[PDB]
Write a protein that binds this ligand. Structure first.
Ligand SMILES: CC(=O)Nc1cccc(NC(N)=O)c1
Length: 149
């Protein structure tokens, strides 16, 4: 798959993260991110996708070594960590045929896994609107503990 880049934006307290809600297949909440263009650098792709989805320019805040990267089904997603963005920032997508809403979420309240259906003796996982964010939540909490404590 084509690599994706974007950002985990935190507020000044480090207890809230900025998620975006798409439509259709991307109907749930997830971090702002998207697919790299041919010949586009990782930092430039992250900033472009975040600016398209939130209207906030991370370019001057990106740190090269500060990111979480996961390989999911043989597609690589790298989110640059961007702390200290004030919660009263005005976020507006460029692309409202693509983004329904933009909200801050408490990191401690977000799930880091889906719930099974063991009460129903059925296999699989129950739907969760944070599906696209979930894989990054534990690595993020671990990264924030290492970096700040
Ligand atoms: C394209 C990309 O960034 N990969 C990604 C990111 C978050 C969650 C999932 N989860 C899944 N599709 O199963 C995949």
């Amino acid at each position: 798959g084509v690599p994706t880049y974007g950002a985990i934006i935190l507020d000044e307290t480090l207890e809230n993260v900025l998620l975006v809600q798409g439509y259709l297949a991307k109907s749930g909440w997830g971090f702002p991110k998207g697919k790299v263009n041919k010949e586009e650098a990782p930092h430039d792709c992250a900033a472009r996708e975040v600016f398209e989805e939130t209207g906030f320019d991370i370019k001057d805040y990106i740190c090269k070594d500060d990111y979480i990267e996961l390989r999911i089904n043989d597609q690589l997603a790298r989110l640059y960590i961007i702390p200290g963005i004030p919660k009263d920032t005005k976020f507006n997508p460029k692309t409202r045929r693509e983004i329904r809403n933009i909200e801050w979420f408490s990191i401690e309240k977000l799930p880091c896994h889906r719930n099974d259906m063991t009460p129903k003796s059925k296999l699989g996982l129950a739907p969760n609107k944070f599906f696209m964010a979930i894989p990054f939540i534990r690595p993020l909490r671990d990264w924030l503990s290492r970096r700040f404590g």
